[PDB]
């Protein structure tokens, strides 16, 4: 579908938050866009390990 909402990057599967560097979502894009991969996830650590006892 099509909607009045606004963005900076777009692809057939949806309009896209251009904040983050990467997608794994769909290669085709137009705009100021993240970059596609073949991956499941990508998550940097801010914190560190969690062990109670």
């Amino acid at each position: 579908p099509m909607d009045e909402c606004d963005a900076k990057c777009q692809t057939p599967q949806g309009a896209i938050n251009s904040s983050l560097p990467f997608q794994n979502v769909h290669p085709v894009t137009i705009g100021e866009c993240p970059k596609y991969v073949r991956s499941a996830k990508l998550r940097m650590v801010t914190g560190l390990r969690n062990i109670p006892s």
Binding site: P1, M2, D3, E4, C5, D6, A7, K8, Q10, T11, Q13, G14, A15, I16, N17, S19, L20, P21, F22, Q23, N24, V25, H26, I30, G31, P34, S39, K41, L42, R43, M44, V45, T46, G47, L48, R49, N50, I51, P52
Partner: protein, 108 residues
């Protein structure tokens, strides 16, 4: 009697990563680099609307198929919208050469 100890943080968090030397490596805090999600919409750039063909092929768009709205008002736009299988090719057939090149020329 009195004592001093080191200290550091843990929490209730179970957010994980994968790592060189261990997998599902739980941490307290994390950050997802990735934008794995899409809003499932066709928004527009910047306040600039895109062009829409609806059902039409580009031939039905450019040439002046009456069932395709001409839309001379659409002087410039953000990007072009089609479907994969546009309904309205040419009502009177005829080979259309350099479709690729034309569409590249009308990329923007």
């Amino acid at each position: 009697e009195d004592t001093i100890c080191i200290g550091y943080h843990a929490n209730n968090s179970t957010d994980t990563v994968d790592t060189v030397l261990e997998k599902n490596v739980t941490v307290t805090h994390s950050v997802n680099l990735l934008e794995d999600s899409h809003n499932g919409k066709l928004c527009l750039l910047k306040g600039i609307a895109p062009l829409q063909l609806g059902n039409c092929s580009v031939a039905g768009w450019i040439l002046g198929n009456p069932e395709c709205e001409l839309l001379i008002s659409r002087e410039s736009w953000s990007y072009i919208v089609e479907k994969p299988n546009p309904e309205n090719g040419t009502c009177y057939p005829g080979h259309f050469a350099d479709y690729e090149e034309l569409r590249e020329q009308l990329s923007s």
